[PDB]
Amino acid sequence: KRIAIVGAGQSGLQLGLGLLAAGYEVTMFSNRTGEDIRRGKVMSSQCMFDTSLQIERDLGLDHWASDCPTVDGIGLAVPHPEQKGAKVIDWAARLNASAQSVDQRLKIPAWMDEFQKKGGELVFKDAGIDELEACTQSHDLTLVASGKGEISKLFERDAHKSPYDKPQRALALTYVKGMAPREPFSAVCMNLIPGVGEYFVFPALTTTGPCEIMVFEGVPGGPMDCWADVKTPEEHLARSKWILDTFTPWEAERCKDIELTDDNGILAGRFAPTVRKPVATLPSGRKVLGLADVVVLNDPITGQGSNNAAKCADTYLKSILARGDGAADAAWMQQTFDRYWFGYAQWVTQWTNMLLAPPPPHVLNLLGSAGAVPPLASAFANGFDDPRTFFPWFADAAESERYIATCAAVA
């Protein structure tokens, strides 16, 4: 009946709003005001594919569906090693159903407002152990949904599920107005720069209206690990254009007139992919359950964290409702996570962690073959809505050849 959530983010607010609609009392702790979120720095590029969007629709939370531009496909390009300014791989495929990117600076504050209107108890505090000890005495279940916040480290890192202990990419975001729209359909335009990094770009909705989000990922120490000397929004926009001019001149043609959406429409950072154990034990001996990025944190290279957050909150909501009047004990907590991990997130995580490493030959062959086998390009693109569908053919050479043949037979 009474549920506490620490962290008013994507997963926490989605879960809390779903619980309020199911008749629960919900207490939520936020460490920021809605307006400070709206006007602060961007946090994500939040490209959500149709399955995730549908979870929001089923809860009545798709408040920006008509205003947010759709992302209608996925494109992949690789620079040509010899031919200057050209591409050796350049293909695209349409998504079976649109994706959408609604700036968390819009969504989270609006969902905070809705949470209050629907009877939630919003408490404004940077929560720590004392708040978790208090919550665990007055609530039937307490979840930690604090994303990358320091309190997420209460949960023990799971070494076996975490192959990396260091960041594998240097990240940056740039929200811009003025970019030439993609024709004849919008897409996530992926640009893979061998041994250097990746640039992704797609339309989105932010606090000043429709835009495009530039996403940069650089191999640490390399030419796209280039944000440390950037100290002003103007320097950040300049650096963004320098990457395109240097590595993706075909995308620079779309950017002759770009401007930041706002001075806080920029981000630079990095983190190590990490999986954690879901049950944390407080000094009192009482227990809390971690949600979404607290327990499974992937590098953004595959565009999956928000998708994972919506699917994780959906799985946890269903588990809570199915438990009914039963106690939310450690066993129940652990099984709830296990269903998320073994059923889904282990495959998103293995796929993303593989793609962070240098691509093996059979992967380069897949990417080339997709350009000449449209069913394979379509399988690649739509796999982003459910990355389980990449296994076993993406990771294994022999299986990749079998799947290429399957796709070729229906081309």
Ligand X SMILES: Brc1ccc2cc[nH]c2c1
Q: Mark 16-55 with x for binding to ligand FAD (rule: CB under 6 A) and - for no binding.
A: -------------xxx------------xxxxx-------
For ligand X, the closer of residues 77 and 301 by Cβ is: 301
In Å, the largest CA–CA distance within the chain is 66
* Binding status of residue 6 toward ligand FAD by CB under 6 A: yes
Please provide residue 115's backbone torsions phi and psi, each rounded to the nearest 5 degrees: -55, -40
Give the tokens for residue 110. 């609006």
Q: Are strands 188-193 and 70-79 parallel, antiparallel or unpaired?
A: parallel
Q: Shortest distance, CB of residue 388 to its own copies, whole angstroms?
A: 5
Q: Is 126 annotated as a binding residue?
A: yes
Which H or E run contains 317?
A: helix 305-323
CB of 13 to ligand FAD, least distance (A): 8
Residues numbered 250 to 279 that lie near ligand FAD (CB under 6 A) are: 267
- How far does the chain reach from its first CA to its final CA, in angstroms? 54
Q: Is 293 annotated as a binding residue?
A: yes
Stretch that binds ligand X, among 9-17, 89-97, 283-291, 294-302 (CB under 6 A): 294-302
Whether residue 186 is annotated as binding a ligand: the answer is: no
**337 closest CA partner among 145, 159, 148:** 145
The rounded distance, in Å, linking the Cα atoms of 191 and 79 is 8
Q: Is 10 annotated as a binding residue?
A: yes
**Using N-to-C axis directions, what is the helix angle for 361-370 and 374-383, rounded to 10°?**
110
56, 46, 65: which is closest to 147 by C-alpha? 46
CA dist 368 and 387 (Å) reads: 20
Binding site for its own copies (CB under 8 A): 50, 96-97, 160, 279, 319, 322-323, 329-331, 333-335, 338-339, 342-344, 346, 374-375, 378-379, 382, 386, 388-393, 402, 406-407, 409-411
**Two structure tokens written together for 183:** 């024709």
> Could you tell me which stretch among 160-168, 235-243, 297-305, 308-316 binds ligand X (CB under 6 A)?
297-305
For 314, the 3-state DSSP assignment is: helix
Interface with ligand X (CB under 6 A), residue from 5, 143, 215, 366: 215
Alpha-carbon distance 109 to 124, whole Å? 13
| Residues from 376 through 395 that contact ligand X (CB under 6 A) | 384
| Number of chain positions touching ligand X (CB under 6 A) | 11
Query: Binding to ligand X by residue 196, rule CB under 6 A?
Result: no
**Of residues 45, 98, 104, 400, which one binds ligand X by CB under 6 A?**
45
Find out whether 306 is annotated in a ligand binding site: yes
109, 203, 278, 300: residue in contact with ligand FAD (rule CB under 6 A) = 300
Sign for the pseudo-dihedral over CA of 28, 33, 36, 38: positive
Cβ pair 281, 191 in contact under 8 A: no
237 binds ligand FAD (CB under 6 A): no
Measured from the Cβ of residue 88, the count of other Cβ atoms closer than 10 Å reads 15
Determine if 47 is a binding residue for ligand X (CB under 6 A). Answer: yes
Cα–Cα–Cα angle for 145, 149, 154, nearest 5°? 75
Comparison of 153 and 185: residue with beta carbon closer to ligand X = 185
- Measured from the Cβ of residue 1, the count of other Cβ atoms closer than 10 Å reads 10
Say how far apart CA 105 and CA 183 lie, in whole Å.
Answer: 28
Q: Which is nearer to ligand X, 290 or 305 (CB)?
A: 305
Q: Which amino acid does the sequence have at 4?
A: A
Q: Is 301 in the site for ligand X (CB under 6 A)?
A: yes
Q: Report CA 301 to chain centroid distance, whole Å.
A: 9
Known binding residue 98? Answer is no
Q: Which residues are annotated as a binding site for FAD?
A: 10-11, 31, 44-45, 47, 104, 126-127, 293, 306-307
Footprint of ligand FAD on this chain (CB under 6 A)?
Answer: 6-12, 29-31, 44-48, 126-127, 145-147, 149, 151, 171, 173, 267, 292-293, 300, 303-307, 309
Footprint of ligand X on this chain (CB under 6 A)?
Answer: 45, 47, 74, 188, 200, 215, 300-303, 384
Q: Which residues are annotated as a binding site?
A: 10-11, 31, 44-45, 47, 104, 126-127, 293, 306-307
